[PDB]
C-alpha cells in the first residue's frame, strides 16, 4: 500500500540532492544572493501561472544540480532559470508552460531560440534524469499518517506549502534531504494551526528521521520565514 511507496521514495532522495555547494565553482560571477533573487522570480512566475505547487521546488532542484557541475555566467542566469521552470512544468503538469509564455516573462531578453537550445543543454547536463524526488512529494503520505481528518487537511496542506516554497528560495536548505524539508515544514505548519514533542516524534517516526534533526530543522525553517 502506502508503506511500500514511502520506503522507495526515501531510498531515492540521495540521488536528487545536489552533490555539493557550487559557489566555489561559479566564483567568478555567481553569488548566493543572485541565486535567491532568481528564486523569487521563479516563484512569481509559478504563482502567476498557477502552476502545480511542485514545479517551483523541482525547477530549483534542476538549477542547483546544473550549477553544481556547470560554471555558467551572470547574464545567462535568467535564461537558465526559465529552462528549469519549463522542464519542471513539462514533467509534472497536465498543461505545461510554453516557451512563449516564459519568453514574455523574461521581458523578451530571452529569445525563443535560446530556450529551445538550452532545454537540450540542461537535459544533457542532468542526463535527462528529471523525475526527481522533492520535499513536496512527501506531503500526502505524511499527512495521511497523522491524527487529522481530511475534513481539515485543506488549510494545513496550503500553509505547509509556503514553508516548502520558502525552503526552495533559501540556499541553506538546498542540500537538505527532501524528506526532512517536508517533515520539517509540515511540522511548522501543523504547530501553527494547532504538544510539540509528541508531534515531532510522530513526524520523525514516519520518515525515519531523528527527533533531534527534525527539531533543529523545523526551528530553522520558522526562523528563516521571519527573516526572509
Amino acid at each position: 500500500g502506502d508503506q511500500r511507496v514511502l520506503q522507495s521514495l526515501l531510498r531515492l532522495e540521495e540521488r536528487y540532492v545536489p552533490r555539493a555547494s557550487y559557489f566555489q565553482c561559479v566564483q567568478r560571477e555567481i553569488k548566493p544572493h543572485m541565486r535567491k533573487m532568481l528564486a523569487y522570480w521563479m516563484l512569481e512566475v509559478c504563482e502567476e501561472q498557477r502552476c502545480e505547487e511542485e514545479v517551483f521546488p523541482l525547477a530549483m532542484n534542476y538549477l542547483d544540480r546544473y550549477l553544481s557541475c556547470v560554471p555558467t555566467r551572470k547574464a545567462q542566469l535568467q535564461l537558465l532559470g526559465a529552462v528549469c521552470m519549463l522542464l519542471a512544468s513539462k514533467l509534472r503538469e497536465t498543461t505545461p508552460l510554453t516557451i512563449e509564455k516564459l519568453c514574455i516573462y523574461t521581458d523578451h531578453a530571452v529569445s525563443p531560440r535560446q530556450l529551445r537550445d538550452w532545454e537540450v543543454l540542461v537535459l544533457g547536463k542532468l542526463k535527462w534524469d528529471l523525475a526527481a524526488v522533492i520535499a513536496h512529494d512527501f506531503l500526502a503520505f505524511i499527512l495521511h499518517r497523522l491524527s487529522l481528518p481530511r475534513d481539515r487537511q485543506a488549510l494545513v496542506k496550503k500553509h505547509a506549502q509556503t514553508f516548502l516554497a520558502l525552503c526552495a528560495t533559501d540556499y541553506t536548505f538546498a542540500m537538505y534531504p527532501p524528506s526532512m524539508i517536508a517533515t520539517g515544514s509540515i511540522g511548522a505548519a501543523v504547530q501553527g494551526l494547532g504538544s510539540g514533542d509528541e508531534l515531532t516524534e510522530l513526524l520523525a517516526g514516519i520518515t525515519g528521521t531523528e527527533v533531534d534533526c527534525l527539531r533543529a530543522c523545523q526551528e530553522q525553517i520558522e526562523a528563516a520565514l521571519r527573516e526572509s
Partner: protein, 291 residues
C-alpha cells in the same frame, strides 16, 4: 563521446550499436531516435518523450537486477527542425534465443528453467510496480548475462518510437502477442503475462509455441490449444467476432509441451488465460507452488 565497435541486430527499434565506454571499459548499447526540436508555439520538446525518458532514468536508481539500465542520454541537433536522442543502455550480448540455441538435448534442467522464470517474473513485477508495461516481450529482448542473471530490455519505449517509421512493423513478430492486443479491445497490464507463457513453454520446446502469418492467423493458432472462450469471456466492441472461429475445446497442456511437472502445467493454464481479468499477475505467479 562513446566509441562504437560492433553492431546488434535489428528489431522494432532500428540499428542498435554496440559501443565502448572509454571510462568503465563496459560495453553499452547505443540506441538512437530522432525527436521533435521545434514547434508552432515556440521551441519545445514533446512532453511525452521527455517524460518517458525521465521515467526510465528513474528506474536505474532502484538498480533492480532483472532489468536493463539506462546509463546515459545523449542529444545532438543534427537537423535544423528535429533532434537525435541517443539512449545509452546497459549492454549484454547473450539473449534468450542464443541461450536456448546452445541448449543440450535434455534442454535446461527443472531447476535451471525454474530460476530463469523466477528472475523473469521478478523483473516484470518490478516493471508493473512502477507503472511500466512491456508491450512486446520476446527472447530477442530478454537478455541473459554470462553470470546467468536475467535482464529485461526494450520496455517503456512506447511514445518514443511512435514518431518514426522504418518498416519494422512488416516483420513485427506477433507470436508472443496477447489476444486482446490482436483484438484491440483494451490495453492492460496482464498483456505481459501472456508473453511470459509463450516463452515459458519455449523453454521446454526450443521452438516457439504459436506461429501466425498475420493477426487473424495468430488467433487461429491460439484457440486451437486453449480452446474457444465463453460468451461471457469474449469482449465487446471489437473487429473480429467469436463466430469467425470454429468452436474448440481445452486441450491437454503437457501434451503440447512435454516434460512439464505437476505445478508446471497448472501454472501455464493460468498464464495463457484468454480473459486478462482472470489471467494471474506476475506477483501471484512468483509465489506459486512451482517456483
Amino acid at each position: 563521446r562513446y566509441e562504437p565497435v560492433a553492431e546488434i541486430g535489428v528489431g522494432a527499434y532500428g540499428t542498435v550499436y554496440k559501443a565502448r565506454d572509454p571510462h568503465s571499459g563496459h560495453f553499452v548499447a547505443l540506441k538512437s531516435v530522432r525527436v521533435p526540436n521545434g514547434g508552432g508555439g515556440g521551441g519545445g520538446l514533446p512532453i511525452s518523450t521527455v517524460r518517458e525518458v525521465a521515467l526510465l532514468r528513474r528506474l536505474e536508481a532502484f538498480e533492480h537486477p532483472n532489468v536493463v539500465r539506462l546509463m546515459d542520454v545523449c542529444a545532438t541537433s543534427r537537423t535544423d527542425r528535429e533532434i537525435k536522442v541517443t539512449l545509452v543502455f546497459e549492454h549484454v550480448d547473450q539473449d534468450l534465443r542464443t541461450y536456448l540455441d546452445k541448449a543440450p538435448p535434455p534442454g535446461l534442467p527443472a531447476e535451471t528453467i525454474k530460476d530463469l522464470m523466477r528472475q523473469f517474473l521478478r523483473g516484470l513485477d518490478f516493471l508493473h510496480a512502477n507503472c511500466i508495461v512491456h508491450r512486446d516481450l520476446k527472447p530477442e529482448n530478454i537478455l541473459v548475462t554470462s553470470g546467468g542473471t536475467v535482464k529485461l530490455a526494450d520496455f517503456g519505449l512506447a511514445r518514443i518510437y511512435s514518431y518514426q517509421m522504418a518498416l519494422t512493423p512488416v516483420v513485427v513478430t506477433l507470436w508472443y502477442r496477447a489476444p486482446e492486443v490482436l483484438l484491440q479491445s483494451t490495453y492492460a497490464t496482464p498483456v505481459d503475462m501472456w508473453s511470459v507463457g509463450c516463452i515459458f513453454a519455449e523453454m521446454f520446446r526450443r521452438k516457439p509455441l504459436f506461429c501466425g502469418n498475420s493477426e487473424a492467423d495468430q488467433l487461429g493458432k491460439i484457440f486451437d490449444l486453449i480452446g474457444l472462450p465463453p460468451e461471457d469471456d469474449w469482449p465487446r466492441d471489437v473487429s473480429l467476432p467469436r463466430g469467425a472461429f470454429p468452436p474448440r475445446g481445452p486441450r491437454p497442456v503437457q501434451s503440447v509441451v512435454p516434460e512439464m511437472e505437476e505445478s508446471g502445467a497448472q501454472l501455464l493454464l493460468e498464464m495463457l488465460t484468454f480473459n486478462p481479468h482472470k489471467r494471474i499477475s506476475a506477483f501471484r505467479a512468483l509465489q506459486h507452488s512451482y517456483l
